[PDB]
């Protein structure tokens with residue numbers, strides 16, 4: 001996969017996802033939602049999309065990833081939508097691992113308006 | 119895919135998911151969780167399940183999708199469980215795009231009670 | 237799939253995921269995040285990872301699953317990171333169904349630093 005940028009790491013073959021990094025320091029008070037820039041652009045492989053999902057180490061602090069879908073044709077900078085749903089302030093440091101990207105297959109079906117059975 | 123109902127849109131082939139729409143206007147104060155009706159029933163293709171996941175435009179407002187799994191055999195009306203985890207009230211308008219549905223493959227394995235290695 | 241432990245249930249072939257159970261009673265005040273033990277270890281099938289995602293019955297109460305990725309090589313006890321993002325206290329009972337595990341395919345790609353097109 002072609003990438004451009006400094007915020008995504010090669011993964012081990014036994015891991016599902018690539019680490020995504022914060023491109024700058026981010027402060028999140030309780031309740032705050034911010035789009036965290038990663039500095040990364042990429043060319044997803046044809047036939048696939050990208051799921052941005054939490055790291056367990058980050059989720060255990062009460063930070064959540066909102067949204068999560070990178071469409072095959074998305075070519076701009078990846079932002080991770082992060083919310084502090086905990087009741088303690090958190091600071092994410094520049095270059096800290098904040099989420100992971102997992103590549104999954106796409107399925108395209110026509111929608112047919114009819115009668116749902118069963 | 120056979121659908122019945124007015125709250126799901128055809129997608130571009132370069133997009134992962136189908137937009138899901140609110141079937142009525144929904145108000146969410148901070149902290150409120152509601153099951154938002156979409157008015158949609160569908161027949162998932164055999165061998166697949168449906169992931170309901172957030173839209174980036176909605177997640178950036180601090181709304182989250184809870185749950186997310188539509189099982190292949192589910193034939194009733196799709197509801198999107200939405201929570202306002204932000205600290206500002208939000209109104210979702212009738213027919214607004216509130217989430218997306220992505221079709222993913224199913225894997226069925228027997229569970230065997232034994233000794234986990236490695 | 238080889239499992240070791242008392243907190244994961246066989247699934248119907250028409251369901252996407254396996255139920256995960258709380259290994260002990262858990263109290264969550266509003267805003268609290270806890271790693272809920274399941275008592276389960278497993279050997280994911282090679283070529284796959286495990287997505288821990290919410291049950292609709294649990295998500296409708298305003299509990300969310302944070303994180304969610306079990307990597308193919310993970311052999312320790314599965315913990316479900318659960319947060320009460322609602323404004324009502326909740327108690328999860330011992331052996332209650334708290335989340336589901338869905339097995340999904342892995343995709344491994346090399347990252348190539350270059351110029352993103354299109």
Ligand SMILES: [Mg+2]
Pocket residue numbers: 064065182183300301
């Ligand atoms: Mg969430």
